[PDB]
Design a protein around this ligand. Structure first.
Ligand SMILES: [Mg+2]
Ligand SMILES: [Mg+2]
Ligand SMILES: [Mg+2]
Ligand SMILES: [Mg+2]
Ligand SMILES: [Mn+2]
Ligand SMILES: [Mn+2]
Ligand SMILES: [Mn+2]
Ligand SMILES: [Mn+2]
Ligand SMILES: [Mn+2]
Ligand SMILES: [Mn+2]
Ligand SMILES: [Mn+2]
Ligand SMILES: [Mn+2]
Ligand code: NA
Ligand code: NA
Ligand code: NA
Ligand code: NA
Ligand code: NA
Ligand code: NA
Ligand code: NA
Ligand code: NA
Lengths: 387, 387, 387, 387
């Protein structure tokens, strides 16, 4: 039951199942995986595709001949399995040169290098068929207040993204960009810390249509925010270009648990939203099998990501299709929320005594919302306990 | 020393010093204050002005004659003291009718009433000389996932703000709107939970130039975010129309401590930013004297808000003016951060071997940022411990 | 299905279903309930009993004749329904006199009054058959560092609890005390903020056997802690005298959602622990039906607390009884965790070359824990998705 | 000014200034330091001593001859500088063998090895003159609910600490143990997550007098708790055997900022408490110079830890010595808090009409606490803004 197929568009980063287990306090617990191994194993589990940072696929500093051989082997694995590559990204965070940032490093020479590193990888992403290019500015930020003038840093970040937009336009590429917010870690505070801040920034770019967001479940939850609500705002703005699925237990370091772990009810409401809205992008997992696991546990954890999505999809669909739930949604006036407040227009509203002088505020205030019954129907559906 | 004057544009809500001390668990500890009393006492402390919700100035449900008398007495107090009213707002949160929201209530009749209540108060705000009209949507949100379709709620919130913009345009008013984000409390999650989400929303309004943000120190800190960073993004966007100053100890219920309490170093960096950027708006305090205090403690707490701002202003100015700090800022390359990455343009960057093939990444990575020395100079200046 | 019966020992505070809906920003949305009404309605839902603060049952300041009549009516309702009263507590937080504390108020006269108020209610609790007397020191704490010397406050808190222990001993009562920790709210920081701090304090009382803890789900989660882990430590110490069940979404104000809401997987692990350990006390709900609800929603929310406990009980029992789970627990060495490290004793351990010189650390480190497979079996059982 | 001397008992872990800068996302930015270098540089800054994990001083897996040479070189550096070694600890977290724990690993062979590794290092600590042996159980915990039975884990943790107590008793050593709590990171939840939980656990050991706590500023703040309050409880219990000083910005990953950074006002109240209580132990810094820094920034950051302690010590002493503050403390009844509630005894309290029938609750409730004036005097003293 709940068996994933490529149809479900489940994707995984090479760095997810390939995470060797090094953490702030501990050495690696697993050997490095050849990307070819990961592609073949993920395909066997029913994944649709993989994603990569440049330096996951091509060791940093590789010669041109080494780069070609790494890409050739990877493409053979994709061809052997039918796996796709819908998204790629640049590693602008691991190498010590990026310790103060890539695009917003105080040192101008580093900013220029970061752009050139990204541009090289955009070319590769396009050659592999990627539709989306993600940017996670994990080093953009500060541990202290004097270190980073945020207005200047935002100017530099806009300049960088505008140059990348000029680049893809000039080459005729169809790829689009997706900015991944995170509030903190590894920097004390990271620039563009939430979906909202990223959406706001995009509106000030020269070609805003080329940019959207790549929200990650656990990153919004590291600020204690409601991930489904933030996804709703991204959808409302037309900017949900990609998504990163995982789990998180609240306000902690970025745990990258398998999807469904962490906040299970938020996972339910997320799947309900994505499916109801008809989100058509990859269901991408940015997770880490815990370092306690051997490789059998790696593949079990990856399989669990997909399984949990499919269980939640079934339960959310049953919730929405249940005539008792539909009645409860009407009892709670969800239908009214979807109707305009004043399609009659401003003057008619100002002239409408039913909206002020003759509005019976105490009668209105007496009406219960019936939200608790609705929520218990949702709980019963999630748990398969209807009756 | 540190004596405030009206020149400093310090303002206070009537509901701040007038808070009677009722909390989730406790009855009022102070009698209600007449707004006339608050105006006269605040003026004696050196405040510039006050702000109000409709229902702070005019008891809910007052007749027209009662409304006129309350406003007349208030205006006499303003005239007697020279106090101004730079900002006003609507209470769309206390009355039970607003239990599911004002502008985004599921019930359409409530949404229409909320708009009419706001419009009536915009007229009054203009008559009192206010430049800014704040909206704090404290009831807009949910405790459960099925109760509120966030895309529909954002449609209703946009409709409401668009109607208010049509209204002020039609009346020829110069007032502008400022949206106050908050992540949670009293709703489990509130819509537009951060400065970023509010900035992003504004960009989708029909007349975005009429709307900005009113960020509150403690509200951003309730999501664990960096308040100075968020203010920098608002300034970068040209949207810092007003600000609410207070203190907060991290991720808790909204404490509304006096300004300078809570995160003292964030208060220092905030004042540094506001003064450096030339922010010209009110320095408004949205705080609550703790319920442990009698009226002498109320006025002591209000005086402390202003005193702490003025101490921090002195220390931040001394930091920026110190030639040793200026040298440390150059050592940390803050000057370079402010210079364009690639004013030479995209093609020149692509052709520049110094940005890629000839970039010595290990030499770059070896350079220290010297941020710790800079931050200790900042600490020494804040504490008055230079030497 | 999942129908509660008095056998299940589900109990509710009068103040839970009776909460009128006043919050930091909003007036009451529901009329006050007569305790007689609440007893009869809860009995109809299958509750076992109720609990009370003194001032929930007897209005503060009542005369002796008024007190007798309120108690008589309540006892008739209990007799009419078969409902029990297993626990009672004192309200040392609502009245303004308690603004700086009860037992740890700086004012000595208030501390003495708080003790007398509690002692009067212990007598009543015993007359009603209560086995446990809870103390929630919600006003014990501070908003500022100079206001409360914590060593002195702990001396006063120990003195108070020691006097109460002397009192019950002297009267021959069998009741025991349960201290309810909370980290903050309504005070900026509350003394004894977690289960651990309360357990540690109890060990320094003169008669520690008379005192245990009353942990509340949401209070531990307000510090981001793992509630099942804290309950395990309380059980390990022999100190889980009572428990408060509810839901919470992480690090926020105390939400008091119905049980099962908030962190659903933590609720599953909690029920698994309570049932596995054979906890025999009341399953008490300290929750608040949201202020959006009318009375039908109040009773729906209360019914949901019990329903969710019973669903989780079924799922946790099925998890523990499944031979595949039992095999996975052995694969993860949960059996070994339960066996002594060195029953052979210290000298034998020191002499055992297999514990040092001949321990193959790399072979040990290569063994996977198989925790992800185990956790996915747990998820499948919780969701009823085995297969 | 503020120049540290060995008299001040400032100490640093080898792993602090020696941190190479590897984080969850980034490679090392600094070369490894020879412990001899660190001892000599710290001495030049005015430190009193250093501390070590076994594997900081002796590379894991060293032969006996290699171990002797590493210790000999270190002891020569200590002799050359006058630096002391007051504390040592075991690394039971870095090596992959400890991925599920040391003392509470599910695998019994690992638990036995962890004990033998610790015992070997206790012998070395004693030879170097250490008075305290710290245990930080950073791997004791879980990412999932089924992986770790916490009651069984606490049994194993008690067994381990009891064996270590038997060991030191049997060898006649004067060293004592200090348990360092942390709530999470690197495990999803760590056992004994706060000072309170550790204090409670110690009370159940066979020889509790041999064990205390080593609280760390940032670890308590990762649960949003008040660090000075927790230190007060440890002092009240007689269990503050050692302390780790650093900074933290709230509920995040463990930042290990220099002391004084993060929550500056909490640092002030901590120093006030330690000095007022006469804490006589090391002032130990467990911090990490940010990875942005070169070695000059490492030593600047270490110097800043000590400088900030000394500034705060001066300001707290001036606060306590100021006759205006002493008057404000009396106005706020801090003197009364320190006096027994009922030295007259239980019967006299029960017979005292002034404690109940004749207690004027409204007159008591009208008295203001004057805490805001007191706190503003504290702010003025911290900032050196008295006047
Ligand atoms: Mg629709
Ligand atoms: Mg500039
Ligand atoms: Mg057992
Ligand atoms: Mg004393
Ligand atoms: Mn992540
Ligand atoms: Mn991601
Ligand atoms: Mn606020
Ligand atoms: Mn505000
Ligand atoms: Mn609660
Ligand atoms: Mn409770
Ligand atoms: Mn730490
Ligand atoms: Mn430490
Ligand atoms: Na700039
Ligand atoms: Na979209
Ligand atoms: Na709509
Ligand atoms: Na602006
Ligand atoms: Na005392
Ligand atoms: Na127990
Ligand atoms: Na055991
Ligand atoms: Na002590």
């Amino acid at each position: 039951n709940y068996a994933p197929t490529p149809v479900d568009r489940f994707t995984f980063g090479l760095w997810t199942v390939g995470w060797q287990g090094r953490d702030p306090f501990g050495d690696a617990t697993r050997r490095a995986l050849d990307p070819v191994e990961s592609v073949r194993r993920l395909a066997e589990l029913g994944a649709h595709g993989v994603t990569f940072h440049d330096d996951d696929l091509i060791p940093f500093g590789s010669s041109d001949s080494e780069r070609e051989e790494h890409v050739k082997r990877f493409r053979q694995a994709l061809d052997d399995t039918g796996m796709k590559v819908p998204m790629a990204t640049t590693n602008l965070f691991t190498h010590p040169v990026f310790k103060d940032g890539g695009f917003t490093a105080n040192d101008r020479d580093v900013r220029r290098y970061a752009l050139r590193k990204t541009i090289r990888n955009i070319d590769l992403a396009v050659e592999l068929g990627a539709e989306t290019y993600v940017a996670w500015g994990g080093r953009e930020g500060a541990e202290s207040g004097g270190a980073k003038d945020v207005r200047d840093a935002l100017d530099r970040m806009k300049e960088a993204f505008d140059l990348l937009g000029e680049y893809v336009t000039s080459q005729g590429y169809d790829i689009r960009f997706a900015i991944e917010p995170k509030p903190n870690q590894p920097r004390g505070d990271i620039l563009l810390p939430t979906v909202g801040h990223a959406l706001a920034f995009i509106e000030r770019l020269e070609r805003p249509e080329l940019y959207g967001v790549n929200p990650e479940v656990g990153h919004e939850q590291m600020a204690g925010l409601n991930f489904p609500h933030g996804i709703a705002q991204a959808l409302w703005a037309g900017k949900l270009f990609h998504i990163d699925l995982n789990g998180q237990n609240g306000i902690k370091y970025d745990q990258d648990l398998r999807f469904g772990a962490g906040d299970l009810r938020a996972a339910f409401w997320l799947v309900d939203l994505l499916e109801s809205a008809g989100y058509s992008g990859p269901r991408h997992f940015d997770f880490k099998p815990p370092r306690t696991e051997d490789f059998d546990g790696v593949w079990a954890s990856a399989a669990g990501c997909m399984r949990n999505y499919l269980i939640l999809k079934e339960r959310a669909a049953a919730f929405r299709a249940d005539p008792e739930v539909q009645e409860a949604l009407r009892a709670s006036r969800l239908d009214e929320l979807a109707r305009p407040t004043a399609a009659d227009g401003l003057q008619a509203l100002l002239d409408d005594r039913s909206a002020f002088e003759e509005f019976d505020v105490d009668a209105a205030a007496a009406r219960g919302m019936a939200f608790e019954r609705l929520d218990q129907l949702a709980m019963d559906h999630l748990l398969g306990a209807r009756g």
